[PDB]
Write a protein that binds this ligand. Sequence first.
Ligand code: IAC
Length: 415
Amino acid sequence: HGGSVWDAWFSCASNQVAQVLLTLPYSFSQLGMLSGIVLQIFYGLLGSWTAYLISVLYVEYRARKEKEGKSFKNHVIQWFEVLDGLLGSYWKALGLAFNCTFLLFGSVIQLIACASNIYYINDHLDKRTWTYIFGACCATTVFIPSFHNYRIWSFLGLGMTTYTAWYLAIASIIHGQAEGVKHSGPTKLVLYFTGATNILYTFGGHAVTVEIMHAMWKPQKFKYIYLMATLYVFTLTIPSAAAVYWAFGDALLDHSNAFSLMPKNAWRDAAVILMLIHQFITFGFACTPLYFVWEKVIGRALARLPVVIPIWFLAIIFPFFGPINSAVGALLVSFTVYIIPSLAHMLTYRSASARQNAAEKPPFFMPSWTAMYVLNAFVVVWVLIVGFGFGGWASVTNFVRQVDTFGLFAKCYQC
Ligand SMILES: O=C(O)Cc1c[nH]c2ccccc12
């Protein structure tokens, strides 16, 4: 029987980094080594803190509900229901819109990544119609009611992502310096900020953390799981991305995907196959809550047939891999992952009486709530400035430049 603490850690490790492990070298080449590492560590700490914040919010909500006299024997609670139960009505609507649109764009991003990854295996025709082909495969997931057995998928994802990251790191050991390798790190404004926003995408929770833990016999212990997961990711990602960037110099500015330039061999082929499988599985994971909300609002494929088609069409109309990541980071992720949780926490715990009856006290090494106040202020201000205030100022400019250079419904991109 799955759903245990170990299974929760496996699922967190599998989900926290699914497809951004291939774009990160592009962001690093866009940013640099030292700055990239610093930003990754800072955003990892912030993501872990926000995960703890969401966990404590859920724990408090559950405590209040159990005080009221509500039972959840056959019920599962999502993030928006908690937002409704804490803040109000318009706030519930905002949270739903944000997380739902974020999940839709995440499905689109996953489809784009899957298509781009398969593009490097065996291609003899135009890429757009290949995405058309993958559309039917993506839509076929409607038949399965749900991925109840998340344990096997989490195990496979963890193992295969570990192997892929380790191989990406290892190959560069003898791959050697690129012919006439050149490193320049940051160059100017738009590119630097675009990379600094695309990094934000892969170091949060991706608005799935709420259900990641349910069924756990000890729900209150999410800090351990997340911290281990975030760290595990660090070990997987920092060496791999750093090694790839060092090996290939400034060749990642135009070839965002790593597999584009690596030599063709059996190990690489296995890596791309594993990445495609993981991309499909995580696409299903991301789409499941959207399907659930859609069914619950509207009232065995016809129920969710009219929701996939927009996803497929939006993936088709845009073939961009990294720019889309930057845009979603500067527009959607930067709101439904960091700003909303902090704002909700502060709004709910503004008064002192609620603090007195807190479900969970913060651990020893933060001996005051004033530190929490100041940390929330710092995170919200910083994410507003560089996430929404200026991250978009670069991401949207990059998208406009893209469309200028390629237009709409581009058949092939980065080729
Ligand atoms: O695929 C990604 O870019 C990141 C990611 C991991 N799990 C997700 C669930 C929904 C949307 C995006 C993601």
